Amino acid sequence: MGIQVIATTPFKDQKPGTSGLRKPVPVFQQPHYLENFIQAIFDTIEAPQGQTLVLGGDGRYFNAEAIQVILKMAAAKGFARVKVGQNGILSTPAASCVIRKYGAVGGIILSAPQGDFGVKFNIANGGPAPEKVTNAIYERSLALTHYSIYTAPDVNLHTLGEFPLGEMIVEVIDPVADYQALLETLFDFDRIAEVIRTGKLRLVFDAMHAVTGPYAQQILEKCLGAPPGTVQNGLVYAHDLVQQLFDRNMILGANCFVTPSDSLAILAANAQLVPGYRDGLAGIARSMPTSQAADRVAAKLGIDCYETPTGWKFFGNLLDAGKVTLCGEESFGTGSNHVREKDGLWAVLFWLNILAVRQTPVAEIVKDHWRTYGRNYYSRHDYEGIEGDRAHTLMSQLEQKLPSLVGQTLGAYTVATADNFSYSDPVDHSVSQNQGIRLIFEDGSRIVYRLSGTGTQGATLRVYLERFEPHPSQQHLDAQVALADLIQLANDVANIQSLTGRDRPTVIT
């Protein structure tokens, strides 16, 4: 029955941030809440005329109804076509792939405190929206008096094809096809299927949930022949398997978790074993608080190693410019220039290709990596819920002390660098300042302090502890034992206990 203007009034906290707008499901269900935010997104696209929008999500409650609103608003917007996943299903790496392949203007990914609802906006290069766009969406969400939508019955998404909706085409694509074709240009799927068939080696992963869901289903079990039950539908630690180093399948059993910090280093050190990275890496990038494990690898390969502020956001300029091929973020995962997002399956397949070529279990690959490059012991200590400006007093009192720290020896560690991390973008030349305090020692060890959640009633102080151990006989300690000396130095110099009243960290990774 056609395009309609519908009056609305602003909501107050439609401020996206790093992963898009994440609110409890009832908050997104408020009348006009979703429409307000989607309207604010579309008002940043100026020339939708012949453009394509990508659309999908992770199933889960409210996604089905939300995709129907987004389609109907896209038709009113004037998009030529919306590539939407079958049954509304599209993963974040898949959407990044699909956006990049077809030149889409961007995409809306509906994925996600456990139980929240999330709306993410990705732009033309396939990556997350930069802050200048996110802030523009939030500001528009506070000034809107109306929105446009095409009133029509819901479009069925069970079967593939092109379906009309106004002047717009609703193309229901296979969620996995394009994305699996990209993964097949990067890895030897033949050799991966072989090492699963023999079933002698555990499966390795570095991002939580990488070995679950319908993508890991179709690729690992249906395509690559893994035994049913391998993929969970909605764990042994590699450091444990190395300590325990001093007939039935193995894939189907436990999966071996390698931290994103070490995984990025190992993957880069074995990159030339796989088809997609045989000619070599252009460079590596990690978020600043990620451990320096990949630094040691880049140095031996003679490639640059970029240190960016936390976010898969800053990786984008380096990947587009060809300065970087592999990248990783502490406690989040790894990825490459094949897409513009963290990719858990990519790392899982990349590990499985290494295991198939080197013919050796994960625990030996890791033990050998540390033998060659040294181990970067690495734990994060979170102090959650400090009040607002006591954490700010902690960071200021420490920032004050930093110039005098340089050159001095505190216990066993000599300070090479004590600074407030700033990043000058080698492409943007945009400076990001005050991204955390770094104590960098000459032996290669490090202590990093960052504040998070500034804006809430409370803030979280994060302390990153890193000890570099070159001696192979010292490379299988318990991480907290190995870090004990750096721990009590980090606490003393910052005066954590005296200035926050906390005796224990809240969380210790």
How many Å apart are CA 77 and CA 151, to the nearest integer? 13
Closest CA to 370 of 302, 451, 297: 297
Which H or E element spans position 195? helix 189-198
Q: Are residues 312 and 128 in contact, defined by beta-carbon separation less than 8 angstroms?
A: yes
Q: Are residues 327 and 305 in contact, defined by beta-carbon separation less than 8 angstroms?
A: no
- Site of tokens 């035994």: 227
Q: What is the CATH number of the domain that holds 49?
A: 3.40.120.10
What is the amino acid identity at position 181?
A: A
Closest CA to 449 of 458, 440, 462: 462
Tokens of 446: 């490090």
Q: Residue 443 gets which letter from DSSP?
A: T
Longest dimension (CA), the chain: 76
How many Å apart are CA 78 and CA 47, to the nearest integer? 9
User: Residue 124 in 3-state DSSP?
Assistant: coil
For 359-381, letters b (16+ CB in 10 Å) and e give eebbbebbbebbeebbbbbbbbb
User: Which residues, in sequence order, are CB contacts of 81 under 8 Å at separation 6+?
Assistant: 52, 53, 168, 169, 170, 171
Enclosing domain of residue 38: 2-178
Helices of type H across 302-373: 315-320, 344-358, 362-373
Q: Are residues 447 and 352 in contact, defined by beta-carbon separation less than 8 angstroms?
A: no
Alpha carbon separation from 264 to 255, 277, 325, 331, 335 (Å, rounded): 18, 14, 11, 12, 8
Q: What is the CATH number of the domain that holds 443?
A: 3.30.310.50
Closest CA to 209 of 91, 340, 288, 314: 91
**HSE (CB half, 13 Å, CA atoms) of 36?**
26
User: Which residues, in sequence order, are CB contacts of 134 under 8 Å at separation 6+?
Assistant: 15, 16, 17, 121
User: Residue 171 in 3-state DSSP?
Assistant: strand
- Site of tokens 């528009």: 140
- Specify which residues 460 forms β-bridges with: 452
Which H or E element spans position 295? helix 293-301
- Helix, strand, coil share (%) of the chain residues, nearest 5: 35, 25, 35
C-alpha angle 80-82-84 in degrees, rounded to nearest 5? 165
Alpha carbon separation from 22 to 130, 252, 311 (Å, rounded): 17, 34, 17
What does the CA dihedral 330, 334, 336, 339 come to, rounded to 10 degrees?
-100
Phi, psi of 365, rounded to the nearest 5 degrees: -60, -45
How many Å apart are CA 499 and CA 58, to the nearest integer? 43
What does the CA dihedral 64, 67, 71, 77 come to, rounded to 10 degrees?
150
